[PDB]
Amino acid sequence: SYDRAITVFSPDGHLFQVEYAQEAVKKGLAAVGVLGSDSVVIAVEKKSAVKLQDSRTIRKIYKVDANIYLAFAGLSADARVLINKAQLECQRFSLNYEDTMDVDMLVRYVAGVQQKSTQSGGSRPFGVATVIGGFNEDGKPHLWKTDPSGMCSAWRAVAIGRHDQTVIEYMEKSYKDGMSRDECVHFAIKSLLEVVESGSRNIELLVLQYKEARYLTEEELQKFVVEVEKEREE
Amino acid sequence: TTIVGVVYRDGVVLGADTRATEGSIVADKRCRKIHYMAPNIMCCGAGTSADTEAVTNMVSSHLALHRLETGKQSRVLEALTLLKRHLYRYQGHVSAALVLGGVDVEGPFLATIAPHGSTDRLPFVTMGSGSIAAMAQLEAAYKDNMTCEEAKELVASAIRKGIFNDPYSGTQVDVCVITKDKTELTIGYDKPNERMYPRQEVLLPPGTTPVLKEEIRQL
Amino acid sequence: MAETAIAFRCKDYVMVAAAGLNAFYYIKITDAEDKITQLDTHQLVACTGENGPRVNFTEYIKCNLALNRMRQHGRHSSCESTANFMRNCLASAIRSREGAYQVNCLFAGYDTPVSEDDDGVVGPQLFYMDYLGTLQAVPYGCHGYGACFVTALLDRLWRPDLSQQEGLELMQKCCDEVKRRVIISNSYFFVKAVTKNGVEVITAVH
Amino acid sequence: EYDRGVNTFSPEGRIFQIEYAVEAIKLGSTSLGIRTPEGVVLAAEKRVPSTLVVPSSMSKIMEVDSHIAAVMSGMVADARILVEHARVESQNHRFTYNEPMSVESCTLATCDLSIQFGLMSRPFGVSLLIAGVDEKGPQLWQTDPSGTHTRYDAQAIGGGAEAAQSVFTERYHRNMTLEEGETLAVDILKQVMEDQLSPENIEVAVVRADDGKLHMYTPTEIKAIMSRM
Amino acid sequence: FDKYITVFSPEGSLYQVEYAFKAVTYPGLLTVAIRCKDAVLVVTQHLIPDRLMRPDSVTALYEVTPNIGCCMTGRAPDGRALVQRAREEASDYQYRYGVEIPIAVLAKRMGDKAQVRTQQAGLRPMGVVSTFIGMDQSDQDGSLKPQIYTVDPAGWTGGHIACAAGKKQVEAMAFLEKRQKSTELDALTQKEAAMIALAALQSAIGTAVKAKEVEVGRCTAANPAFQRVPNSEVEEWLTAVAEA
Amino acid sequence: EAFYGLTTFSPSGKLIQIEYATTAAGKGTTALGVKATDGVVIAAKKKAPSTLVDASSIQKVFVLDEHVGCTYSGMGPDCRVLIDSARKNCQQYKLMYNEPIPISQLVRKISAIYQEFTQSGGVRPFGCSLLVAGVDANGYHLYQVDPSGTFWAWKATAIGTGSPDAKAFLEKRYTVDMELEDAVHTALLTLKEGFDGQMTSENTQVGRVVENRFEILSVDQLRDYLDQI
Amino acid sequence: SHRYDSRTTTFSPEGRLYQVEYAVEAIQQAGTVIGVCTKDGVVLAGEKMVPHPLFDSESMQDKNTSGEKMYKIAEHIGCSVAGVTSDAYALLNYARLSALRHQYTFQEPMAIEDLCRILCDEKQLYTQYGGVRPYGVSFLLVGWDRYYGYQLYSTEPSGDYSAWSAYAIGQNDQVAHALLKKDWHESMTLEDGMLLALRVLGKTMDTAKIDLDRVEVAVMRKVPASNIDQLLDPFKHHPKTTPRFQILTRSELKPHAERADQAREAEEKAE
Amino acid sequence: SIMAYSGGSVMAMAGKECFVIISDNRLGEQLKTISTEVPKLHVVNDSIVYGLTGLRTDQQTFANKVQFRTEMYKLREERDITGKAFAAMITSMLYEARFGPWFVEPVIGSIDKSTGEVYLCATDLIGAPCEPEDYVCAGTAAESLHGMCEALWRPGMSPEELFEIAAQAMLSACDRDSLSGYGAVAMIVTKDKVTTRLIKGRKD
Incomplete structure (x- = not known):
């Protein structure tokens, strides 16, 4: 088997392959997560809406288990692999422990797969950050992020992809605890529009409440984009 | 099953009966038990039909391949070694029992391979459930430097002893003659069993059997 | 064999019943182990045999179905799919190191249009499986010591077009015959049906 | 950077990837450890990248076992791996010998995973401090990416380390109380941190000699330390 | 970048294989082989400059099987290794088929072995030219015909009537081509052949050879086993060359 | 033990090692093939380096099975690899289906081996092209396989050195009506075009697919065709 | 040997994977393929290479299983490839087995999007593990399943894939996209899609008329089911219609190509 | 016996340019x-069952x-498998499993579409073929089916x-087999x- 060492320290302490995976995640589409009282909101940029892509709904927020949902930024195909692994892990877990996987457990599994790939000979890192959101089987909502180094962290709100840090600086200023469902969706839409152009056909947005996951219809979303783009003039 | 080989002045004759049983029922009255192995080598088999077919095919194929590598004619002793090595490895579980006969540059070559992978090169041989009956006609009549006809008659005679005395053997005698130049296989060299009452056409005219449904489909 | 399961399918439902008994040699532990496992919204499997196998087999299927429904954006597998997956899993096991899953199933489902494009079979489906991975569509079937009493009773009484109510009545005669004639107390039966509207538990029969 | 394979020695007798992994530990958040006869103290700069982070989630101090804690500096994800192995090893020890693993034995078994690189593409870019209490009383060790453990009485790792080894040299005596230790810990962090030291910005834990159990200071109890200074 | 690994150059050539051919001539030894009607001979130089080296200990002639000799020309230890592999091949073949490996098959298998080293990276091609000689039974009459098969570092295998490898392999060949326009080489006698071989060796290396500076190997229809020809008899051929 | 790939994409999208292998495979001597209504002929130059080579021992045309043959250009020993594998495949197929492998399936199998050596680690591609000619239930066939692993059915073609010109000359003389006597005549005429020196039944080899079998012409049979050109 | 490793699965400094970028360059060199997803079927129209007069047919007995650009993966799944042809055949064989393993296990047709994920997982692998080069191939898959109806995906060497209503891979894909943008709509017949597929294909390869010699067309559509053998499994349901992948003979395609000359003559009148 | 557990019998016979299975x-x-309602026949293609x-x-x-093998065959090869290949294939598959066999006993009928040559083949469970010209058969009622086919079968019958x-033959024999019918x-x-x-047929 090919087991050359791909990820290695350079002189000044850095792991270039991991810095470059992270560069691939800064080129990816933005995604944003917001945590309210009883809701997690995951919102992602879509690439645009060319008249050619299938008008059948393709989700860019992925379901990992009943209770857990994952957005990503970076290489689509890497992401798809991570997600399949995550999906398969949550089932392995149900199957071993009967209980459903806590979100944090799922996140740690994923981050470990990411970390593992910065240290496995033969492989480059996944060039993927993830936002992961969901509720445990105790009504507590969570929101996490993984980066390609394999580091995860829980957040009250978060952004990944292009201009992540512009968006995170924005959100630090505004964000309050104990938002409502509707204030969450607002806050997420607001935050995304810091970097996305229109709010028309280039935002998918998912709302997670204990035991109920629901994507905004393109209509429900547009009442929120007007309600928000009208608040950006001021 | 009764197979037989003899060496004669110019070559080898093999012979076989043709009854393929299953259990105590004749599944096929007229199967071929004399397998092609090479242009100058044939095999007959006895034992477990499936094992015999697998093994001869495998070796036949290997020798075909080996013949393209080497450009030469297959040697009967390569055939034999491939067979015995294979059978030996399966410790009898591959219950093929072969008579192998060919003619190579070194002359006629007749041999038995037993399922455990022993060989015995000899001037006449038998295998199969009919083997003892047939062997007795060979011991009684074999001689060195038989003419081809002498050899065929004797091989047929020996196979008839199995056909008529072994239950597992029957129908008719097939023989194969192998000379340096060519391999002439002759099905029904002896047919000593016609049927003695002509079949009685039982008349069953269309619509005789009650049908419930029918689907026809054209092509 | 100690725990009898029964099923049959009419035009608009498939109804499945299975004995609560859980035993340990002769010691009756409960008459209330539900051995009818719902696998999906319109698919359930009445499964009989030792808890070990029965639970591991059913939990495997239930997971793999669930997995596959993720990796397929929320779409329900057809009942024939699921049954073939179960069959292949059983079958594979009889030639495995571990050995046959000693369980016998009735797999019942109701197939609804999965989309606008689905030209597929609509309605109730019922399959008889055995631990070796035999798999046969049947209009009714049974496993267990009562299996034969009931099977002959259904051959007598079942019609393809029973109402949901005639079905409860008929299932009750089935359960009752198993109590009348099997030495093993199958005192309580769980009963469920699948319809266009999913799995309903049925408490009117036991 | 792939010019030299990863098992290569420099002309000074150092393996290059090890020296580089060490360089990565100087980019890390400062962590530190103080042996006292009353117990050990670990303290870490959390160094969160945002107020939006939930600080419990960026846990630079980790229970290895009831009596052992570790605190990393460098690549956190790499540290999660080592601590998972320590946890497994510490628990295998209880399993097998029905007693708590010594702290040294634990540190060893965590270095036993760091030797492995050629297997692991590269070394872990992580230094741990592993405080604990066993039969020989409170103890503090340091792993490096070399795989070389080293018992210490006080130590820092991270960007701080040089400034914090100044302060230990002056103020650390082998005979301080657990409260004077807590205090010196938090002092050092105040001095070397980038940010303003607040009760959420840091993480403090102690393994007390008396019970031999590890307590993670809540933000409250860390204020109770900042109080007296 | 292509000069050091077994990938193609832009001209479509494998440098490391070409350079392996230079390893064949680098030692400065020449070998010649030749078949006559009922024998085949291989003559190789056997140079022992070191007075203290033990002549009988160094050789480029090797029994592969009793009926196949070979002469390796080139990097000696690479030759020794091919011989081991040949030997293994020959022995695995006897085990599998119950018969001694025909020499054209052995050559072919050794060409396969070499070819592999030219297509899989990081295995150095063996820098030798292998020359197997032996008799070969015909399927028509059962008569033994003599054979010379080479294999080279590219894996190119060939049968020959006569062949030279090593330093001045060109001037040796040129001499034999020239002597093949006169006579028919497969109608010669083991003597007339050996004379031609020895004369070709002498022409090429620009010197007269003595017996102890060559070593000669032979197979004959009469005695098919491969045998080192004794010096007495090589002396007599060398005498027969200087005269006529 | 080298497992990295040697063939890789280059900034224009080309796989350069494969272009070079293709260059190598057109440096052989000329081989060509002509399909006809009732057979196929393939024919190659055997340009022996010297007269001292036993030309009987040089094989440029090969039986793969009773019904199918090949010849090749470019590097002989690379081709010997392909031929060995193709012979095996023919036989594996008979063992399975107890029929002869159809040429289409055979060539796809060859194509696949070539492709593996364009992607698998450690190996360079094959530097030879094949013609494969044979007869199956779909009739007579003639295919070219290149080192890319690409293959083409042809009615006539030529690989190796004189090949552009040989192809040009086959374009003229080829007719869809052609019978096999004329095909051979055309094949041999086409070789002769770019042949330095006399053609003999020694320095040329010819294979024909006729009826249901492939055979390499004897020197006797080939001499009768070379007396009519 | 490690000095000579070209490090195919490494990132470059902008998080780019060069071997995958360059596989894409290889694909933009390939014969154009157009796909158009209607509601009566899917159409693939591809540029064959220029037909030398000495090319033969393979004389295959089944005309619809493969052509030069178009291959059937299963009864319900077809594809067309652009890029390194031999890589295609490796993958195509993989996709065939996958679809049939799915059918082994579940006894129903694999859905198009799962076949597609399987395929692209196989590609993604080579961009991450293994130190060899990626598959230099782009599919257009088409087919029909009960979940989503007619579908048309396209894959890339990275392993990403996307669903489309219409799309193009190969040579002048940017140009062909722009032209499908303008002329695709949601309510096309099959004939309309076949037209659109040819108008675009003929517009990208710069021909006055469509050059029947240089064009292959395949269609994936549902047709009446013939071999309902219902006495043989009584309980099994057999749908009235079933998907069929069809490659058009030169003659079946002649009308549709004339009809696209006529809508290229009637678009040079307005000018 | 494991071969008898599930019951069932199958039989194929040749006539002039036709067979019945x-x-x-x-x-x-x-x-x-x-x-x-469990017939044991599978249709491979127009000419093989x-x-x-x-x-x-x-x-x-x-x-x-x-069915995996045959569908794969048809894609790779772009033609229908023929009964000889088909039966060779089967035999191969059964023999792979020689040391842990599939408890099945296939019975194959086929007809070359051109010629009209008819090929029957039955195999034991490890894949020994039986290629008679008349009729083959297998299963629980196999003794009796040989009885009947011997008696009733003659050369060159027409489809009807x-x-x-x-x-x-199938019915008479199945009426004497508890496990078939x-x-x-x-x-x-x-x-x-x-x-x-x-x-x-009978309902017993």
């Missing part, structure tokens, strides 16, 4: 009948393996005559035409 319909676990007998789970498994003697399904296969017929 026929199965009974029962599926059992020993003496328990589970279904009376086969039946399996033996342990039903293995019939199912193996038939599915055969051949159907009648196939059906009488509930009438039969039969496919008559000519060059031009396939005809399936469900035949009425």
Whole structure:
């Protein structure tokens, strides 16, 4: 088997392959997560809406288990692999422990797969950050992020992809605890529009409440984009 | 099953009966038990039909391949070694029992391979459930430097002893003659069993059997 | 064999019943182990045999179905799919190191249009499986010591077009015959049906 | 950077990837450890990248076992791996010998995973401090990416380390109380941190000699330390 | 970048294989082989400059099987290794088929072995030219015909009537081509052949050879086993060359 | 033990090692093939380096099975690899289906081996092209396989050195009506075009697919065709 | 040997994977393929290479299983490839087995999007593990399943894939996209899609008329089911219609190509 | 016996440019009948049909393996498998499993579409073929089916005559086998035409 060492320290302490995976995640589409009282909101940029892509709904927020949902930024195909692994892990877990996987457990599994790939000979890192959101089987909502180094962290709100840090600086200023469902969706839409152009056909947005996951219809979303783009003039 | 080989002045004759049983029922009255192995080598088999077919095919194929590598004619002793090595490895579980006969540059070559992978090169041989009956006609009549006809008659005679005395053997005698130049296989060299009452056409005219449904489909 | 399961399918439902008994040699532990496992919204499997196998087999299927429904954006597998997956899993096991899953199933489902494009079979489906991975569509079937009493009773009484109510009545005669004639107390039966509207538990029969 | 394979020695007798992994530990958040006869103290700069982070989630101090804690500096994800192995090893020890693993034995078994690189593409870019209490009383060790453990009485790792080894040299005596230790810990962090030291910005834990159990200071109890200074 | 690994150059050539051919001539030894009607001979130089080296200990002639000799020309230890592999091949073949490996098959298998080293990276091609000689039974009459098969570092295998490898392999060949326009080489006698071989060796290396500076190997229809020809008899051929 | 790939994409999208292998495979001597209504002929130059080579021992045309043959250009020993594998495949197929492998399936199998050596680690591609000619239930066939692993059915073609010109000359003389006597005549005429020196039944080899079998012409049979050109 | 490793699965400094970028360059060199997803079927129209007069047919007995650009993966799944042809055949064989393993296990047709994920997982692998080069191939898959109806995906060497209503891979894909943008709509017949597929294909390869010699067309559509053998499994349901992948003979395609000359003559009148 | 557990019998016979293959319909676990609507025939293509007998789970498994193989064949090869290949293939598959066999016993009928040459082949469970010219058969009622086919079968029958003697034979024999019955399904296969017929039998 090919087991050359791909990820290695350079002189000044850095792991270039991991810095470059992270560069691939800064080129990816933005995604944003917001945590309210009883809701997690995951919102992602879509690439645009060319008249050619299938008008059948393709989700860019992925379901990992009943209770857990994952957005990503970076290489689509890497992401798809991570997600399949995550999906398969949550089932392995149900199957071993009967209980459903806590979100944090799922996140740690994923981050470990990411970390593992910065240290496995033969492989480059996944060039993927993830936002992961969901509720445990105790009504507590969570929101996490993984980066390609394999580091995860829980957040009250978060952004990944292009201009992540512009968006995170924005959100630090505004964000309050104990938002409502509707204030969450607002806050997420607001935050995304810091970097996305229109709010028309280039935002998918998912709302997670204990035991109920629901994507905004393109209509429900547009009442929120007007309600928000009208608040950006001021 | 009764197979037989003899060496004669110019070559080898093999012979076989043709009854393929299953259990105590004749599944096929007229199967071929004399397998092609090479242009100058044939095999007959006895034992477990499936094992015999697998093994001869495998070796036949290997020798075909080996013949393209080497450009030469297959040697009967390569055939034999491939067979015995294979059978030996399966410790009898591959219950093929072969008579192998060919003619190579070194002359006629007749041999038995037993399922455990022993060989015995000899001037006449038998295998199969009919083997003892047939062997007795060979011991009684074999001689060195038989003419081809002498050899065929004797091989047929020996196979008839199995056909008529072994239950597992029957129908008719097939023989194969192998000379340096060519391999002439002759099905029904002896047919000593016609049927003695002509079949009685039982008349069953269309619509005789009650049908419930029918689907026809054209092509 | 100690725990009898029964099923049959009419035009608009498939109804499945299975004995609560859980035993340990002769010691009756409960008459209330539900051995009818719902696998999906319109698919359930009445499964009989030792808890070990029965639970591991059913939990495997239930997971793999669930997995596959993720990796397929929320779409329900057809009942024939699921049954073939179960069959292949059983079958594979009889030639495995571990050995046959000693369980016998009735797999019942109701197939609804999965989309606008689905030209597929609509309605109730019922399959008889055995631990070796035999798999046969049947209009009714049974496993267990009562299996034969009931099977002959259904051959007598079942019609393809029973109402949901005639079905409860008929299932009750089935359960009752198993109590009348099997030495093993199958005192309580769980009963469920699948319809266009999913799995309903049925408490009117036991 | 792939010019030299990863098992290569420099002309000074150092393996290059090890020296580089060490360089990565100087980019890390400062962590530190103080042996006292009353117990050990670990303290870490959390160094969160945002107020939006939930600080419990960026846990630079980790229970290895009831009596052992570790605190990393460098690549956190790499540290999660080592601590998972320590946890497994510490628990295998209880399993097998029905007693708590010594702290040294634990540190060893965590270095036993760091030797492995050629297997692991590269070394872990992580230094741990592993405080604990066993039969020989409170103890503090340091792993490096070399795989070389080293018992210490006080130590820092991270960007701080040089400034914090100044302060230990002056103020650390082998005979301080657990409260004077807590205090010196938090002092050092105040001095070397980038940010303003607040009760959420840091993480403090102690393994007390008396019970031999590890307590993670809540933000409250860390204020109770900042109080007296 | 292509000069050091077994990938193609832009001209479509494998440098490391070409350079392996230079390893064949680098030692400065020449070998010649030749078949006559009922024998085949291989003559190789056997140079022992070191007075203290033990002549009988160094050789480029090797029994592969009793009926196949070979002469390796080139990097000696690479030759020794091919011989081991040949030997293994020959022995695995006897085990599998119950018969001694025909020499054209052995050559072919050794060409396969070499070819592999030219297509899989990081295995150095063996820098030798292998020359197997032996008799070969015909399927028509059962008569033994003599054979010379080479294999080279590219894996190119060939049968020959006569062949030279090593330093001045060109001037040796040129001499034999020239002597093949006169006579028919497969109608010669083991003597007339050996004379031609020895004369070709002498022409090429620009010197007269003595017996102890060559070593000669032979197979004959009469005695098919491969045998080192004794010096007495090589002396007599060398005498027969200087005269006529 | 080298497992990295040697063939890789280059900034224009080309796989350069494969272009070079293709260059190598057109440096052989000329081989060509002509399909006809009732057979196929393939024919190659055997340009022996010297007269001292036993030309009987040089094989440029090969039986793969009773019904199918090949010849090749470019590097002989690379081709010997392909031929060995193709012979095996023919036989594996008979063992399975107890029929002869159809040429289409055979060539796809060859194509696949070539492709593996364009992607698998450690190996360079094959530097030879094949013609494969044979007869199956779909009739007579003639295919070219290149080192890319690409293959083409042809009615006539030529690989190796004189090949552009040989192809040009086959374009003229080829007719869809052609019978096999004329095909051979055309094949041999086409070789002769770019042949330095006399053609003999020694320095040329010819294979024909006729009826249901492939055979390499004897020197006797080939001499009768070379007396009519 | 490690000095000579070209490090195919490494990132470059902008998080780019060069071997995958360059596989894409290889694909933009390939014969154009157009796909158009209607509601009566899917159409693939591809540029064959220029037909030398000495090319033969393979004389295959089944005309619809493969052509030069178009291959059937299963009864319900077809594809067309652009890029390194031999890589295609490796993958195509993989996709065939996958679809049939799915059918082994579940006894129903694999859905198009799962076949597609399987395929692209196989590609993604080579961009991450293994130190060899990626598959230099782009599919257009088409087919029909009960979940989503007619579908048309396209894959890339990275392993990403996307669903489309219409799309193009190969040579002048940017140009062909722009032209499908303008002329695709949601309510096309099959004939309309076949037209659109040819108008675009003929517009990208710069021909006055469509050059029947240089064009292959395949269609994936549902047709009446013939071999309902219902006495043989009584309980099994057999749908009235079933998907069929069809490659058009030169003659079946002649009308549709004339009809696209006529809508290229009637678009040079307005000018 | 494992080969008898699931019950079922199959039989194929040749006529002039046609064959009939026929199965009974029962599926059992020993003496328990589970279904009376389980014909054991599979259609590979217009010219090949086969039946399996033996342990039903293995019939199912193996038939599915055969359908993978055959569909794969048809894609790779772009033609229909022929009965000789088909039977060789099967034999191969069964023999792979020689040391842990599939408990099935296939019975294959086929007709070359051109010629009209008819090929029957039955195999034991490890894949020894039996390629007679008349009729082959397998399953629980196999002794009796040989009885009947010997008696009734003659050379050069036409589809109809051949159907009648196939059906009488399958039914007469199945009426003497506890594990086979509930009438039969039969496919008559000519060059031009396939005809399936469900035949009425006893309900015991």
